Amino acid sequence: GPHMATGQDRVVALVDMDCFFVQVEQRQNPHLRNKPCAVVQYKSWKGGGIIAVSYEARAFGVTRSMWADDAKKLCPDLLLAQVRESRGKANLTKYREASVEVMEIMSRFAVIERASIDEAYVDLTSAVQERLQKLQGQPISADLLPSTYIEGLPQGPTVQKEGMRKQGLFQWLDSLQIDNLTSPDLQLTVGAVIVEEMRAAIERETGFQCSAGISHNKVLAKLACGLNKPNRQTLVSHGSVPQLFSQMPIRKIRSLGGKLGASVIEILGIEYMGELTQFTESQLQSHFGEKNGSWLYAMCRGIEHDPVKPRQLPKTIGCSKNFPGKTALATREQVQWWLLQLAQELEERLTKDRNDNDRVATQLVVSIRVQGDKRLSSLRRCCALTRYDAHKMSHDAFTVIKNCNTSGIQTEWSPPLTMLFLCATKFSAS
DNA sequence: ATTTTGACGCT
DNA sequence: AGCGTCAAA
Ligand SMILES: [Ca+2]
Ligand SMILES: [Mg+2]
Ligand SMILES: [Mg+2]
């Protein structure tokens, strides 16, 4: 009752660029704008593997992970842009730089947590309080929320999408109590006003469109973001949670898309997130462990406490290449040549990182997979990273993996290597 | 033969 | 420290 916390203390947004790599290529090549297009890596094997797809192409059924030849079967007029290749491998530099562009715009508004190359969480609590004192009890106009959906509305006693959006927003604003500065729904609404402004700034200054979720925690912000894509934002209030969760498959909640979510479904015999409310915390802890149990118990009620971490920069810098099927590396020289290629790209990125962000990596992680191994990594070993020098780094990696060669012969490597991975970690200020 | 990434938990 | 899980374009 009067003491049960409700997790309404923060305003958190999640901003996710729409079909990010496609928008990077469409900005660069206007011929691709407003067309079914996709971004592909490599070209030789089945036309390349698709990694990003415009909404126009998704309408034909084109997806990520599809081979371009197969996507062309679904969408004969599909346009393709190829990821740059350098030193024999895919090079993602253009997209990393466009991402930095967007994160720097977002950082002007608030503390952000970089969640991936194209997504960031935003803690808007303080900015919301400032906007609320500036507003001075003034009602919030629908005009300040031109692309906002209110999850769960309209409800109760037009057939076009934008009509429904405005009806729901009108119901929400009609209800709002702008008299109380501590009102969580008012705080979320002001959050949404700020996110509209941030999204406008991103589009004005980069050309890129994005979607956003606004709620009281990261999990609900992330779920909200996906409810109305592309180029829209969705507010998920605390009161919307019971109905939203009553038909929400467990796997849709972040961290439950894999084995743990599968076990929640199997062990408890449920399908939707709301059904979790019928278990005690101790029951959930018994099945899924103390940490997971407590998390599930609060989450199914819409409550989560994971903070938006102040981290705008990635914590590791890695380079990896697969050598699938018959291309697996079977000679010592091949292995050394590819270690050099990886180390040269890594050196270039590390040097740029040191100049831009005043830090230096101190550990080099080398990972390999051998033909036959079921796991993603067959071997992970670390060593000192003392100089941003590709020849030294490639030598150190070879030194640390050379004992993996079963082969009795000199020049041959067995079992053949199907993957190489170099990752610089453990950054220190410089 | 999705590939190339990046964060975080367990022990 | 090394391994596993979950997620991203
Ligand atoms: Ca995206
Ligand atoms: Mg995303
Ligand atoms: Mg995606």
Residue showing tokens 């994160």? A103
Strand partners, A420: A321, A368
Same domain, yes or no: A103 and A240: yes
| DSSP for A299-351, written as a single string | HTTT--------B-S-S-EEEEEE--GGG-EEEHHHHHHHHHHHHHHHHHHHH
Distance A385 CA to B11 C1' (A): 26
- CA angle, residues A303, A304, A309, in degrees to nearest 5: 150
Rounded CA-CA distance A373/A13 in Å is 40
Residues A11 and A42 in one domain: no
A79-82 and A37-41: which strand pairing? parallel
Could you identify the residue whose CA is nearest to the C1' atom of nucleotide C6?
A: A255
Bridge partner list, A213 = A14, A234
Has A119 been labeled as part of a binding site? yes
Which chain B positions have some atom within 7 A of a protein CB?
1-10
Does residue A100 share a domain with residue A73? no
Task: From residue A65, give the alpha-carbon distance in Å to each of A36, A50, A55, A72, A358.
Answer: 16, 6, 16, 13, 36
Residue A299 approaches strand B within 7 Å at CB: no
Same domain, A257 and A366: no
Tokens 């998704």, located at residue: A58
- Provide the residue range defining the domain that includes A54: 19-88
Task: Say yes or no: A84 and A140 in one domain.
Answer: no
**Structure-determination technique:** X-ray
Q: 3-state class of A66 per DSSP?
A: coil
Q: DSSP string of A225-264?
A: HHHS-SS-EEE--GGGHHHHHHT-BGGGSTT-SSHHHHHH
Omega of the bond prior to A154 within 30 degrees of 0, cis? yes
Q: Residue A95 and residue A21: Cα distance in Å, rounded? A: 6
Nearest CA among A21, A14, A18 for reference residue A41 = A21
How far away, in angstroms, is A4 Cα from ligand 1 center?
36
Q: CB of residue A320 closer than 7 A to nucleic acid strand B?
A: yes
Residue A101 sits in the same domain as residue A3:
yes
Amino acid at A21: F
Of A258, A281, A307, which residue is a domain's last?
Answer: A307
Q: Please give the Cα distance from A223 to A266 (Å, whole number).
A: 23
User: Is residue A170 located within the same domain as residue A289?
Assistant: no
**Residue A264 backbone class (left: φ over 0; alpha: ψ -120 to 50; beta: rest):** alpha
Do A140 and A239 fall within a single domain?
yes
Distance CA(A34)–CA(A37), nearest Å, equals 9
Same domain, A36 and A120: no
What are the contacts of A174-179 at 24+ separation with CB within 8 A? Answer: A176/A139, A176/A140, A178/A135, A178/A137, A178/A138, A178/A139, A178/A140, A179/A137
Q: What does the buried/exposed string (b/e) look like for A55-73 if buried means 16 or more CB atoms within 10 Å of the residue's CB? A: ebbbebebeeebebeebbe
Shared domain check, A5 and A148:
yes
The answer to whether some atom of strand B lies closer than 7 Å to the beta carbon of A372 is no
> What span, in angstroms and rounded, lies between the C-alpha atoms of A279 and A287?
11
User: From CA A161, how far away is CA A281, in angstroms rounded?
Assistant: 40
Q: Domain end: A258, A282, A307, which one?
A: A307
**d(Cα A65, Cα A85) in Å, to the nearest integer?**
19
Q: Are residues A161 and A198 in the same domain?
A: yes
A64 is in an annotated binding site: yes
How far, in Å, CA of A290 to CA of A284, rounded? 8
Residue A1 sits in the same domain as residue A33 = no
C1'-nearest nucleotide to the CA of A255: C6
The structural domain count of chain A equals 4
**Single residue among A73, A88, A103 that ends a domain in this structure:** A88
